[PDB]
Amino acid sequence: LSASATELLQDYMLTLRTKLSSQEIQQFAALLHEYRNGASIHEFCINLRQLYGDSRKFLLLGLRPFIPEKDSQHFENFLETIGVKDLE
């Protein structure tokens, strides 16, 4: 884990602490843990979208480097599809 990845991780955790409610933190922890234990990237994206909707764009963009290589393309397609990079 590089120094830059370390920085990104710290930044992400801080942003989570600043932005999310206890409930949101619990839900994200749950769905992320499910994905970590072997659940599909598809279900991960569904759960993320159900959690954030069109909001929390920063937190979705920040996940991209963390997505495993084999699931990265699906995640990018997801972000592009739901319009995370589209402000208006």
Partner: peptide, 18 residues
């Protein structure tokens, strides 16, 4: 439990790379 959830999140984020 919120702190534990945060620790879980960080741990899982690291684990996805390992």
């Amino acid at each position: 439990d919120e702190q534990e959830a945060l620790n879980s999140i960080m741990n899982d984020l690291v684990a996805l790379q390992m």
